Amino acid sequence: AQNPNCNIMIFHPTKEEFNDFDKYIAYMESQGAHRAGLAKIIPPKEWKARETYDNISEILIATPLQQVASGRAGVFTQYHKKKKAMTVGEYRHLANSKKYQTPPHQNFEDLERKYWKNRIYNSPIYGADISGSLFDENTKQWNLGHLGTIQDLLEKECGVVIEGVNTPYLYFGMWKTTFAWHTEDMDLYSINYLHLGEPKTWYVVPPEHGQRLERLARELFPGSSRGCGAFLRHKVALISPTVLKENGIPFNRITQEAGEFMVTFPYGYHAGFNHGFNCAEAINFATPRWIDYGKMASQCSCGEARVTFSMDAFVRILQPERYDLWKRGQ
Ligand SMILES: NNC(=O)[C@H](Cc1ccccc1)c1nn[nH]n1
Numbered sequence: 001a002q003n004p005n006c007n008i009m010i011f012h013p014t015k016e017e018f019n020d021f022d023k024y025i026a027y028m029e030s031q032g033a034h035r036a037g038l039a040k041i042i043p044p045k046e047w048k049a050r051e052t053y054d055n056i057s058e059i060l061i062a063t064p065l066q067q068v069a070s071g072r073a074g075v076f077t078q079y080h081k082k083k084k085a086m087t088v089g090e091y092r093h094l095a096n097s098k099k100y101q102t103p104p105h106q107n108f109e110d111l112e113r114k115y116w117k118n119r120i121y122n123s124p125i126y127g128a129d130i131s132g133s134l135f136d137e138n139t140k141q142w143n144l145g146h147l148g149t150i151q152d153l154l155e156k157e158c159g160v161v162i163e164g165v166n167t168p169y170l171y172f173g174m175w176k177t178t179f180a181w182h183t184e185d186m187d188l189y190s191i192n193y194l195h196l197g198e199p200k201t202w203y204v205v206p207p208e209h210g211q212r213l214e215r216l217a218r219e220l221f222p223g224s225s226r227g228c229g230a231f232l233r234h235k236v237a238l239i240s241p242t243v244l245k246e247n248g249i250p251f252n253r254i255t256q257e258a259g260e261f262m263v264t265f266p267y268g269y270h271a272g273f274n275h276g277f278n279c280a281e282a283i284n285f286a287t288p289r290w291i292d293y294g295k296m297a298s299q300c301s302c303g304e305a306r307v308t309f310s311m312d313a314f315v316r317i318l319q320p321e322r323y324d325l326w327k328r329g330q
Pocket residue numbers: 128171178179180184190192193235270280281282
């Protein structure tokens with residue numbers, strides 16, 4: 001078996017290999033990339049997402065989110081307090097202000113130490129889940145607005161036509177903005193391009209070991225676990241690498257820089273943080289190998305994990321026994 005230790009793999013496709021997206025995902029899996037839960041893809045030197053980022057300041061962040069933490073430095077939850085709308089230009093200025101700017105640091109490891117030591121004592125503001133794309137329409141390779149849709153994948157594999165659409169989202173980050181431990185909706189894949197700005201550090205648990213993370217999370221967040229049998233779906237819980245190591249949880253870490261793609265694989269739990277002002281674009285996608293994961297994906301039915309209406313059809317078709325209860329939750 002390829003990649004038995006479940007290491008994060010890094011790929012350098014040539015321009016020819018960058019033409020057929022599906023084929024390259026399958027190639028990465030043939031090399032065992034999915035065992036880690038996360039892979040990095042460095043685009044060929046000839047490729048670009050768009051010509052410049054000089055004209056993005058008028059994009060609106062309609063509902064910036066202030067990420068307020070509770071708990072201890074290595075084991076905490078965060079809630080999202082809505083703030084007033086601001087443009088990307090205003091957000092960038094805020095990110096670079098003395099209150100929010102990245103501190104002096106020696107290297108990525110120093111900054112990571114500072115993040116886990118100090119994150120809870122600050123409440124950074126995040127632009128998340130903004131429907132849109134920054135790929136030029138003329139970028140033909142790895143354009144996250146032009147991928148095959150999940151609905152078409154389900155139709156091709158299973159023969160059923162379903163409603164729904166699947167479009168990309170933009171994320172504007174600043175120092176300490178945080179993504180909590182989660183898998184994707186219906187344990188889909190995700191792909192993420194860091195268009196501009198400072199890095200993003202990722203943590204990931206191999207899919208084969210996801211239930212180890214779930215068990216630790218139930219121990220560390222006991223009230224949340226009692227409230228919902230799939231509370232990680234709420235996307236609010238953080239556990240540091242130190243705490244994971246103390247509890248023997250298998251995981252890996254990597255830092256993504258501007259111009260790089262990351263793919264998360266079905267049932268690969270991930271979390272992470274932004275180093276400073278940045279902009280990423282992401283979308284969920286499926287392949288034939290996802291279908292078995294979608295059929296088995298846990299679900300939140302307690303009401304907290306509200307999701308797009310395009311998830312209705314996935315639950316309805318792949319998980320008919322669970323559909324009525326999940327629907328009540330929505
Ligand atoms: N599935 N979504 C996520 O992993 C995002 C983080 C994320 C956003 C862009 C590129 C890579 C990762 C998230 N989740 N909660 N806040 N942000």
